[PDB]
Design a protein around this ligand. Structure first.
Ligand SMILES: Cc1cc(CN2CCN(c3c(Br)cnc4nc(-c5cncn5C)[nH]c34)CC2)no1
Length: 247
């Protein structure tokens, strides 16, 4: 099944690359709303993207951004993606200052469900930034990454100093960011940020509750091997108490 640029009406830009641009878009015939990513073959990594799209086009999960298909011309490559009406988690955090434990734990559940669904396919994910986390019409979180396989603040010690312990560290930075309003190792300089992650030096403000500290503390281990299984995250009693979504 083929596709062409003239099949779509284009609306407003949703962002800049990442080697290109995303625009709100509509299929002319069905009027079906979607997002179109336009990437340029020069900055093409080229072989890599091909494999990324290979894997992403097989991923069906309510919390993964769907890739409906792709096509290309001489100069560009086009990605036909699901549209997320409600924007980024990063933007929501800005507006709310920080999230409550229920919104936080529901997101963590959703992230962990997606990552486990992918784990069940020997597909693993690297690091995870909030700007790459979008929200569907029902408020459900969606992963929008080229971070599938097989800023410093978001990287585990082993990235700065099926081996998927990286995205468990990611769950912990996000969970902390979500409750707190800023990532755990944030510092005034690059050198300072580096040592904080390397040394795993973070602390909690008093409002952060115990079940939260527990989960976060188990996720932010220097030793990747000691970080929890996704299964253990979803069964964490603080997750179990607070999240509105099930496994
Ligand atoms: C290449 C490239 C990557 C980016 C960053 N980009 C931002 C916009 N993208 C979106 C996608 Br794909 C699907 N749905 C979206 N909904 C929004 C949105 C709605 N209201 C505000 N926003 C930001 N953005 C979406 C994801 C990746 N730019 O060029």
């Amino acid at each position: 099944r083929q596709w062409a640029l003239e099949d779509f009406e284009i609306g407003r830009p949703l962002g800049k690359g990442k080697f290109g641009n995303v625009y709100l878009a509509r299929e002319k015939q069905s009027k079906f709303i979607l997002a179109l990513k336009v990437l340029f073959k020069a900055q093409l990594v080229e072989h890599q993207l091909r494999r990324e799209v290979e894997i992403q086009s097989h991923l069906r999960h309510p919390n993964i951004l769907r890739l409906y298909g792709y096509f290309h011309d001489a100069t560009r490559v086009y990605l036909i993606l699901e549209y997320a009406p409600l924007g980024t988690v990063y933007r929501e955090l800005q507006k709310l200052s920080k999230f409550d434990e229920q919104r936080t734990a529901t997101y963590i559940t959703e992230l962990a469900n997606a990552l486990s669904y992918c784990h069940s396919k020997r597909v693993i994910h690297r690091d995870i930034k909030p700007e790459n986390l979008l929200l569907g019409s029902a408020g459900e979180l969606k992963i929008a990454d080229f971070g599938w396989s097989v800023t410093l603040d978001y990287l585990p010690p082993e990235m700065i100093e099926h081996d998927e312990k990286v995205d468990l560290w990611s769950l912990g930075v996000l969970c902390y960011e979500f409750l707190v309003g800023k990532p755990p190792f944030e510092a005034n300089t690059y050198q300072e940020t580096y040592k904080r992650i390397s040394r795993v030096e973070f602390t909690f403000p008093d409002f952060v509750t115990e079940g939260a500290r527990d989960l976060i503390s188990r996720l932010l281990k220097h030793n990747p091997s000691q970080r929890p299984m996704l299964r253990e995250v979803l069964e964490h009693p603080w997750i179990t108490a607070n999240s509105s979504k099930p496994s």
